[PDB]
Amino acid sequence: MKYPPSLVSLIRELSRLPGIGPKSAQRLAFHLFEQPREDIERLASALLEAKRDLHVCPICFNITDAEKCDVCADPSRDQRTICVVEEPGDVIALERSGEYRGLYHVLHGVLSPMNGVGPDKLHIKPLLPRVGQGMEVILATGTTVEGDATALYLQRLLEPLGAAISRIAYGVPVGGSLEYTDEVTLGRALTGRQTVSKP
Amino acid sequence: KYPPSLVSLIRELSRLPGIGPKSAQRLAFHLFEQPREDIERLASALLEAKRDLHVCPICFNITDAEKCDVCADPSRDQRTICVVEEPGDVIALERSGEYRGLYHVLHGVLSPMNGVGPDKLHIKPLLPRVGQGMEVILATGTTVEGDATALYLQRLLEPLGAAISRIAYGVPVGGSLEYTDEVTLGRALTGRQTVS
Amino acid sequence: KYPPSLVSLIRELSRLPGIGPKSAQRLAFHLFEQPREDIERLASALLEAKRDLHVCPICFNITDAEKCDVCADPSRDQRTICVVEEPGDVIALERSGEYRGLYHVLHGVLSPMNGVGPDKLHIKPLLPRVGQGMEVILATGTTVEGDATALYLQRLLEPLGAAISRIAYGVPVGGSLEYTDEVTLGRALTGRQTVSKP
Amino acid sequence: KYPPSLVSLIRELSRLPGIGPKSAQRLAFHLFEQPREDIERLASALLEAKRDLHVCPICFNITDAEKCDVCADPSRDQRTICVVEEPGDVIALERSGEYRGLYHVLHGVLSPMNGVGPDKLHIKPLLPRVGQGMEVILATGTTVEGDATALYLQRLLEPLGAAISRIAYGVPVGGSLEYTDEVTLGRALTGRQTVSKP
Numbered sequence A: 001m002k003y004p005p006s007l008v009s010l011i012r013e014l015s016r017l018p019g020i021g022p023k024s025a026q027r028l029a030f031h032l033f034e035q036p037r038e039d040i041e042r043l044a045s046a047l048l049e050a051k052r053d054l055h056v057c058p059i060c061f062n063i064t065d066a067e068k069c070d071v072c073a074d075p076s077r078d079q080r081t082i083c084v085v086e087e088p089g090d091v092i093a094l095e096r097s098g099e100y101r102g103l104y105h106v107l108h109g110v111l112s113p114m115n116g117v118g119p120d121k122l123h124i125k126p127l128l129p130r131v132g133q134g135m136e137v138i139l140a141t142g143t144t145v146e147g148d149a150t151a152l153y154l155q156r157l158l159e160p161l162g163a164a165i166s167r168i169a170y171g172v173p174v175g176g177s178l179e180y181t182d183e184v185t186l187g188r189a190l191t192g193r194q195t196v197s198k199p
Numbered sequence B: 001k002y003p004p005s006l007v008s009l010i011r012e013l014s015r016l017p018g019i020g021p022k023s024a025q026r027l028a029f030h031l032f033e034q035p036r037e038d039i040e041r042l043a044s045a046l047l048e049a050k051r052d053l054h055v056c057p058i059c060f061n062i063t064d065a066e067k068c069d070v071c072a073d074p075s076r077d078q079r080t081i082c083v084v085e086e087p088g089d090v091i092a093l094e095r096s097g098e099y100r101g102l103y104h105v106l107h108g109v110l111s112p113m114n115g116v117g118p119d120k121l122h123i124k125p126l127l128p129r130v131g132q133g134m135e136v137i138l139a140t141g142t143t144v145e146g147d148a149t150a151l152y153l154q155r156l157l158e159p160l161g162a163a164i165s166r167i168a169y170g171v172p173v174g175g176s177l178e179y180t181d182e183v184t185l186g187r188a189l190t191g192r193q194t195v196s
Numbered sequence C, D: 001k002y003p004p005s006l007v008s009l010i011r012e013l014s015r016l017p018g019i020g021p022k023s024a025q026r027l028a029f030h031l032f033e034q035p036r037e038d039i040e041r042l043a044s045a046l047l048e049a050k051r052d053l054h055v056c057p058i059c060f061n062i063t064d065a066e067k068c069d070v071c072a073d074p075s076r077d078q079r080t081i082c083v084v085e086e087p088g089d090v091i092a093l094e095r096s097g098e099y100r101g102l103y104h105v106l107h108g109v110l111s112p113m114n115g116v117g118p119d120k121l122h123i124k125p126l127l128p129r130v131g132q133g134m135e136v137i138l139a140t141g142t143t144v145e146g147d148a149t150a151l152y153l154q155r156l157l158e159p160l161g162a163a164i165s166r167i168a169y170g171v172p173v174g175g176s177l178e179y180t181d182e183v184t185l186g187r188a189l190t191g192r193q194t195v196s197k198p
C-alpha cells in the first residue's frame, strides 16, 4: 500500500525516468528521505537550473548554455571535419575517445520511414550550409537499420557539396574474439579489412 | 560536457543509488528533452517529499500525518506489533493485506562487521509499547544480521509480558524446491503445517 | 562443418536442454582438445548411468538397486512419506539433514494447460503406501501447479487416514522482505512460529 | 545423491565448459528419461569424434580426411589465407559467407608471460604456405593478446611475398555509439572508410 501522496507522487515522477522501475523508484524515494535537506534542494535546483540554462547549439545542435557550443567556439579544433551524430551523448562518447578534435553535428535522432519521421524531424537542414569543399563529413550515426539508413541518406544529400564523405568502420569491437562476434559484423570486419603491409 | 548546469545535474544524480556516472549523464540528456512541466513536477515532488515525510512518532514508519495510517486506524489489532527493518517492508507486508496488526520500523539492522551494534539501533520507542497479553513479531530480514537483530530483540523484549514470534522461514511462492537452498527446505519441513 | 562425425556430436549434444546449436559446437571443439581417456570416461559414464539407473519400485526415487537407499535404510521413519516433484528434490531435503523419513517422487506436477493429469505422474503407486497412523508431507513445489497437485494429493490421501502436512511457506534464508514478494511475506507472517511464551 | 553411476556421470558432465554442478545434475536426470538408443548414439558420437577428428596438416582446421574440405575444395580462393585462433573461427567466417578463401588455424593466442611462445601454436607450418601474389588476412580476436599475436604474425610474414591485412576494428552491426566502448569508437573513427571523394 501507499498513502502519503507526497511519497506516491515521488515514486511516480522518479519511475517516469528511464532505467528505473516502480520497485527501484520506491527504493529511491526512501533514500532521498534519509538525505539532508541541502541535497534534496541541490538536486531540485540542479534539475531546474539545467532545464533553464540548457539549450541546443544553433550551429551544430550539441547541448550547451551559450551562443555557440564549446566545440564550435574552441579555435584549436579542426575546423575542417564535421562528425554527424544521432545524439549529444555520442559527442561525449566520441570526445572521451581521445582521437577526434573536429566539429560535430547532431541530428536529434535517426531516420525511420515507418513512423513518417523524415529529415525534417532531424536537424539535417542546418548541416548542409556548414558543409563546403576541402572538408570531410564523417558519418557517425548508429549501425541499426536506422543509423545505416540515416547515413546513406546523409551521404546522398551531402554529395552535391564538394566534401569528402566517410562512414565510421563497421567492425569487431575491441576486446572480443570472433567466436562471440555476430555474423554480419565479421563479414564487415572482413570485407573492410585494412592492409597492414603491401609486398 | 562543459556547461555547469549539466555537470551539476549529473553530479547530483551520480549520488543517488542504482545510478553511476554514465547513467547520470544518460538521465540528464533524457531530462533535456522533457517539457519544463515534467522537470518542475520532479523538482517539487522531491521538495514536497522532504518537507512532508517524517517518521511516525509511535512506530517510526514514514508518513505525512501526525500519526501513520496504520497507527491512526482503530480497526487495527492493537495487541500485535510486527517489528521490521525498513519502512519498505511495511509496504510489503501491507500489499499482502494478510496482516491487520501494527508495525514498528527499526531504521536499520545489527551489523557487527560493519561496526553496527544496537547503539545505532532505535528501539527506545518500541519498548514502551510491549506490555502483557501482546505479541511482537520479528519480521526482521533472515540474514545472519536479521536473525541477530531478532535475537537481540528477543532478549530485549521478552522481559516484558510479551509473546515473541518470528516470520516463518520457508519456501517462497512459486518456488521449486530443487532451486531452494537446503537450510531453507530444512525449515520448510520443521515448520510444515497439518492441512488435514 | 563437413566431417559427419563432428556434425553428429553437434546434433547429439543439441538434444540436451540448456545446450543449443551454437553451444553444441563449442562443446564439440572443447572435446576434440581433450585426451582420449576424458572422452572415454564421459562416454562410458552415460552408458553406465542408463544401464544401472532406474526408479525405486516403491518410491520412484532414482536408484541403482532393487529398493532405493532411503527405502532400504532400517533406521528410517517408515511412518512418514514426503512427496516431492522431481527426484532432485530428495537430494535437497536429504542434503538438509532435517528429514529422516521416506519419500515418494511424483516425477512432475499436475498441469491442466499441458494435458498432464494424475495418470502421467507416479501418483497411483503412492496410494497403497498411505494408511492410518502415518503422515504425508506434501512437499511439492510452491508454484500454482505445485500447489494444485498438493491440494489434489491431499484430497486423495485424506480419506486413507494419515495426517497430511505441507512444507512451510515462507521467507528463504539469507534475505530481507525488500527483495521478497508480497504473497510470500503474507504467508510467511501468517505461518510465524512463536519463539517464547507470554 | 548416492548411486555411483549418477555421481560419476555428474562429475564427468560438470567437467564440460558451461555446465555447473546444478546444470550437470539436471542433464543427468534428463539423460535418465531418455532411451538407451540416444545414450548410445551420444556416447557413440563422442568416441567417434575422438577417433575421426584430427588437425589438417595444411591449415590446422578440423577434418576426418587427409586434408580439410577447405584446402581440398579446388573452387576456393587459393590466394588468400585467413589466420584465425580457433577452428570455431573458421565455421564463424564460413557463415558470414563473404569469404571463399583458405584459412589457418593457430589453436590459441600468444600471451607470452604466462609461458606461451609461438612454438606452442601452429605458426611454423604457415610460412611455406604464404607466397608472392597472395594475401594473409590476420583474423585473430581483439583481446590484448589477440592484437598481440597479429602484430607478431605481421612482423613475421612481412618478409615473405604476400600482402598482410588485419580484420576491421570497429563498431558492430546493430548498435548506437552511446552504447559502444571508448577505444572501439576511436578505432572506428580512425578506421573510417571514406565513401564519397570530392
Ligand SMILES: [Zn+2]
Pocket (backbone or CB within 6 Å): A057, A058, A059, A060, A061, A062, A068, A069, A070, A071, A072, A073
Ligand atoms: Zn556547436
Ligand SMILES: [Zn+2]
Pocket (backbone or CB within 6 Å): B056, B057, B058, B059, B060, B061, B067, B068, B070, B071
Ligand atoms: Zn506508526
Ligand SMILES: [Zn+2]
Pocket (backbone or CB within 6 Å): C056, C057, C058, C059, C060, C061, C067, C068, C069, C070, C071
Ligand atoms: Zn525408494
Ligand SMILES: [Zn+2]
Pocket (backbone or CB within 6 Å): D056, D057, D058, D059, D060, D061, D067, D068, D069, D070, D071, D072
Ligand atoms: Zn586444411
